[PDB]
Amino acid sequence: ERPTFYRQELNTIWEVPERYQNLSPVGSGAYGSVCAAFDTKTGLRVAVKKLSRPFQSIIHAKRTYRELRLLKHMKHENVIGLLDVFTPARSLEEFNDVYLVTHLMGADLNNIVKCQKLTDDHVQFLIYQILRGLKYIHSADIIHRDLKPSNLAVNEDCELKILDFGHTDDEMTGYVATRWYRAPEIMLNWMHYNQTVDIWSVGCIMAELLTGRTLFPGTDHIDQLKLILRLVGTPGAELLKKISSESARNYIQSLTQMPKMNFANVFIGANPLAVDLLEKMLVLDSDKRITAAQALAHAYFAQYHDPDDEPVADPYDQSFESRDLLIDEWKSLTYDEVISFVPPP
Ligand SMILES: Cn1c(=O)c(Oc2ccc(F)cc2F)cc2cnc(NC(CCO)CCO)nc21
């Protein structure tokens, strides 16, 4: 049955089912503003995202469909999930707004690191959960592509969820956290990239949790690359071949060759098992990076690793990605997905 909706001006008029009370602006998220609220039906504190102009263009309509598809698929402890999706619309003809509901999270990882070192046990637990969530995400052939501490949310008990999985040129420019966790092959568009871009990001995050400091705080793309290459060495012939961009490969070759540094001398005092994992994650050749599944079985996570409690995802059909459709067709697909939603247990 259709719930009763009530109206409220927040951020824009918000029209939500009565179950959602005490709506309070919480800021911005991916492609829309977020409100905290109390779900009287479940007793949960929730985050409610209203999408801004979900169907104003083909790009927007497809993006709307994409986010809804991704959130409906994800059913994992360490990945943001969909508690509810609703529209005040009674039909496709009047359908123009989409609201997404998930758990309200207490803080992001930026708030926790706060210029300070975490204990080795904290790093173990936090990275373990990230890799557990990434194993799940990657098993569905989904790539986050933009993992960073601000996308990693935690509750009081340090229970972690990954948000915003699956940025303009300007916001990737300069001394910005938006670029600091990006694998070099995506930062400078070396090649058709895969899942392991996210493992690079995990290495950057893990090192930051260990030192309290940004691993590669480049002032720009070029500065960041030099920072990266100083640690991991300049690419060898083998990797150079795989750089399908003639232009990028040519620039790479202009740089003075540097050997990989000793990670034990970079990360003084750190668990040698942590050092070892960082070495396996922060490999320039993405083909050779440790995967999430492999990293979970690494000795560093001995006290958390359970092969029987690290689930994979159901198959995720993303054939729509290569599909060209009109606005109203993307809208109709989105509508179907809203209508068909079944709330989690
Ligand atoms: C920033 N942000 C979102 O963009 C966000 O996006 C959504 C995704 C899917 C969805 F169905 C609904 C959403 F709102 C959810 C969300 C939940 N908790 C929190 N809590 C934050 C504390 C700030 O009060 C800390 C983590 O940033 N922030 C969120």
Active-site position among 157, 164, 223, 328 = 164
Whether the CB of 35 sits within 6 Å of ligand 1: no
Ramachandran class of 317: left when φ > 0, alpha when ψ lies in -120 to 50, beta otherwise: beta
Assign 35 to helix, strand or coil: strand
Scanning the structure block, which residue is given the tokens 């990670």?
263
Q: Which amino acid is at 258?
A: M
Give the ligand 1 atom nearest the CA of 85: 11
Place of tokens 């975490």: 118
Question: How many A from CA of 212 to the centre of ligand 1?
Answer: 24
Q: What is the resolution of this structure in A?
A: 2.1
How many CB atoms neighbour CB 43 within 10 A?
7
Beta bridge partners of 46: 37, 103
CA distance 131 to 6: 41
SS3 state at 140 = coil
Q: How far is the CA of 326 from the centre of ligand 1 (A)?
A: 30
Nearest to 277 by CA among 148, 120, 141: 120
Pairwise CA distance, residues 240 & 142, whole Å: 26
81 C-beta closer than 6 A to ligand 1: no
User: Which residue pairs from 224-232 have beta carbons closer than 8 angstroms and sit at least 24 positions apart in sequence?
Assistant: 224/179, 224/180, 224/187, 225/184, 225/187, 225/188, 226/255, 228/184, 228/284, 229/255, 229/258, 229/284, 230/258, 230/261, 231/260, 231/261, 231/266, 231/282, 232/260, 232/261, 232/282, 232/283, 232/284
Q: Rounded to whole angstroms, how far apart are CA atoms 337 and 94? A: 16
Beta pairing, strands 160-162 & 107-108 = unpaired
Both tokens of 229, joined, read: 């290459």
298 close to 278: Cβ distance less than 8 angstroms? no
Structural domains of the chain, ranges and CATH numbers in brackets: 1-106+313-342 (3.30.200.20), 107-312 (1.10.510.10)
Edge-to-edge strands of the sheet including 99-103?
A: 20-29, 32-39, 44-51, 99-103, 84-86
**Cα distance between residue 76 and residue 133, in whole Å:** 7
Strand ranges (E), the chain:
5-9, 13-17, 20-29, 32-39, 44-51, 84-86, 99-103, 107-108, 152-154, 160-162
Q: In the beta sheet, which residues pair with residue 233?
A: none
Does 164 participate in catalysis according to the annotation? Answer: yes
Binding residues for ATP: 26-34, 49
Choosing from 10, 16, 24, 26 the residue with most ligand 1 atoms within 8 A of its CB, the one to mutate for a pocket test is 26
